[PDB]
Amino acid sequence: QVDKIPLMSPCKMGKFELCHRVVLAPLTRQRSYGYIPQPHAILHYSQRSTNGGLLIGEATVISETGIGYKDVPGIWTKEQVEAWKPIVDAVHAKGGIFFCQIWHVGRVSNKDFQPNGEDPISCTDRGLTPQIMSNGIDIAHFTRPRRLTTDEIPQIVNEFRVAARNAIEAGFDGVEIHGAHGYLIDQFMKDQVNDRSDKYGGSLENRCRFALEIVEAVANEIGSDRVGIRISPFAHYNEAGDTNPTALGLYMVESLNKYDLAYCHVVEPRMKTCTESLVPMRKAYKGTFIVAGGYDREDGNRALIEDRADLVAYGRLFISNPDLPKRFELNAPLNKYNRDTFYTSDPIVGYTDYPFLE
Numbered sequence: 001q002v003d004k005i006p007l008m009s010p011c012k013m014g015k016f017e018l019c020h021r022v023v024l025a026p027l028t029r030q031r032s033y034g035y036i037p038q039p040h041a042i043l044h045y046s047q048r049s050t051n052g053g054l055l056i057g058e059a060t061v062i063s064e065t066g067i068g069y070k071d072v073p074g075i076w077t078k079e080q081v082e083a084w085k086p087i088v089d090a091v092h093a094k095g096g097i098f099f100c101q102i103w104h105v106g107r108v109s110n111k112d113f114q115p116n117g118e119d120p121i122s123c124t125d126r127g128l129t130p131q132i133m134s135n136g137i138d139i140a141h142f143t144r145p146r147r148l149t150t151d152e153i154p155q156i157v158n159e160f161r162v163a164a165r166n167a168i169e170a171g172f173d174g175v176e177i178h179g180a181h182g183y184l185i186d187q188f189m190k191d192q193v194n195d196r197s198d199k200y201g202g203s204l205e206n207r208c209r210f211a212l213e214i215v216e217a218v219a220n221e222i223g224s225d226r227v228g229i230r231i232s233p234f235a236h237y238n239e240a241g242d243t244n245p246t247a248l249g250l251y252m253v254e255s256l257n258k259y260d261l262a263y264c265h266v267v268e269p270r271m272k273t274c275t276e277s278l279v280p281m282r283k284a285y286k287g288t289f290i291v292a293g294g295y296d297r298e299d300g301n302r303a304l305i306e307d308r309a310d311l312v313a314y315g316r317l318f319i320s321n322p323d324l325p326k327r328f329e330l331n332a333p334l335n336k337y338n339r340d341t342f343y344t345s346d347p348i349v350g351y352t353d354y355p356f357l358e
């Protein structure tokens with residue numbers, strides 16, 4: 001047989017007993033027509049479920065104002081909650097642990113996606129410059145956001161709280177707060193975006209206030225052992241960089257310690273220039289640490305051997321390998337992924353048609 005590897009080692013996380021450390025990263029696939037989870041997702045998630053394996057669902061919108069892309073699922077209506085149930089049930093049928101990633105795009109939207117054509121909301125009133133859409137043909141334009149007022153913010157915090165409850169109602173084992181990639185929560189944390197002059201800005205502490213109020217509200221709502229949060233301190237995605245990423249990341253993990261969460265999920269920096277690294281954050285964080293961003297089998301085992309993380313989340317390789325955990329375990333060849341169908345809308349093509357090991 002093949003030598004055992006750290007990636008296949010059981011891991012205790014929060015109140016859960018995982019059977020291995022290969023995690024399905026959150027992956028927006030834009031196949032949730034009308035913002036409603038679809039039948040084909042039942043198969044998609046089921047194909048990737050393993051006994052005791054952790055699955056993090058695609059970013060799920062917490063309210064009407066959090067929409068910034070077509071066909072992404074939401075979880076603010078009964079219809080969406082009910083549509084989520086069969087998908088969650090399929091994952092549970094195979095013994096998987098399923099966390100719902102709750103999300104709000106903030107300024108990364110257009111009034112055409114908004115209720116009554118309203119302006120997107122954000123920590124600031126500055127908009128994004130145009131971006132080339134996933135199809136590589138069309139250009140996405142964004143509407144300048146309306147700066148949320150100090151007293152409006154708690155209402156948004158409550159939207160995350162309600163979304164978390166709805167996820168529990170749908171049967172999810174827990175929720176992951178989307179505090180990354182320049183979306184609403186990251187907009188408040190990043191100093192290139194947050195130019196507020198009230199208590200939600202002006203200092204590292206103030207910029208992280210929003211994220212921490214969300215953690216508290218969500219943790220108090222469903223229990224901290226059913227809560228995780230994802231951050232990307234070093235990412236500049238959606239024009240959301242920070243002048244001191246290391247300090248930002250350190251402050252967040254140190255502040256998150258007191259909440260006793262199920263885990264903290266951090267994305268690796270794209271480049272190393274003090275220097276960008278997740279090691280200091282792993283050392284400062286006392287709970288379960290999940291890393292993601294460019295990992296393969298070799299790097300995944302190495303991260304565990306060097307004790308840089310407890311869990312390793314895989315995105316692209318999991319898109320093309322339903323049975324990624326098994327393949328890693330057998331050190332089997334991997335299917336290549338086709339980025340051209342990552343965000344296309346077919347129920348099957350590039351979604352459920354990647355083959356299992358022969």
Ligand SMILES: Cc1cc2nc3c(=O)[nH]c(=O)nc-3n(C[C@H](O)[C@H](O)[C@H](O)COP(=O)(O)O)c2cc1C
Binds near residue numbers: 029267314343
């Ligand atoms: C098609 C696609 C969709 C993604 N959707 C999300 C998402 O909804 N939420 C999120 O936090 N990250 C999202 N990500 C980022 C991934 O979770 C992960 O961090 C990324 O794939 C980095 O790792 P990899 O080298 O294993 O692909 C997405 C990535 C891809 C390629």
Ligand SMILES: [Cl-]
Binds near residue numbers: 195197198
């Ligand atoms: Cl302000």
